[PDB]
Amino acid sequence: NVKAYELRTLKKKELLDKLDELKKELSGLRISKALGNSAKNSKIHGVRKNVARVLTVYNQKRKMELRQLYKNKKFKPYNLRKKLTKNKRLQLSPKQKAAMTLRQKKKVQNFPQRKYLVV
Amino acid sequence: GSIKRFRLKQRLGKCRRQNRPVPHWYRLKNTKRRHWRRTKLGL
């Protein structure tokens, strides 16, 4: 029934091995079901779940490795890029939006909107 | 007839599957049946 916290520590090969075993077990169960049996029909669900868990663990490991590989370097795969609503991606970064023509900037610096308490 | 496209065959199969009645055990915790002669799939 193997829960994830055990599996994080395992190396990828070991994980793969585990997964194959689980798959084999599942296949066996399926075969049994197909044949006139209902002894361990309900065992299958758990096995399936276990398999799923294993897959998840492995997938996340793989993703982490990928991320490590493509750390920085301007361009990246579009997977490892910031998946985010298209419009937002298109949109100008806040900094870009801010960026002021030099005269305007100067003006801002000189005559900023002051605080002035009226009495 | 006796020469279908794969898609059509699959659809037919789906329809057949849909046809079958409520599994009786559920009733312890159907109106969309279709008889092949009276109501057509209209494919």
């Binding site: 910031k82 998946k83 985010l84 609503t85 | 898609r7 059509l8 659809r11 209209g42 494919l43």
Partner: protein, 89 residues
């Protein structure tokens, strides 16, 4: 004419004008014409008309699960940065 306008002529009704329509699944793909009556299938465009309000309602964005759109809803509310989990323990 035995194959006259009514019942006799309904005997000669075999052979579909429309089949199933890749895209809409609505048995309204005119085979001979190669064009769906409720889509405009080959036209990259959905063929909907403001004169058909019922039609519009029976195929809008809400009608059918929204595999991705639904998932993205709530994200604004959350405003979580992408890639980020919660703290463990």
């Amino acid at each position: 004419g035995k194959a006259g306008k009514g019942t006799g002529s309904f005997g000669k009704r075999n052979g579909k004008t429309h089949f199933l329509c890749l895209r809409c699944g609505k048995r309204s793909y005119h085979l001979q014409k190669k064009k769906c009556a409720s889509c405009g299938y080959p036209s990259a465009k959905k063929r909907r008309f403001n004169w058909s309000v019922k039609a519009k309602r029976r195929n809008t964005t809400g009608t059918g699960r929204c595999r991705y759109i639904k998932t993205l809803r709530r994200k604004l509310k959350n405003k979580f940065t992408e890639g980020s989990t919660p703290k463990p323990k």
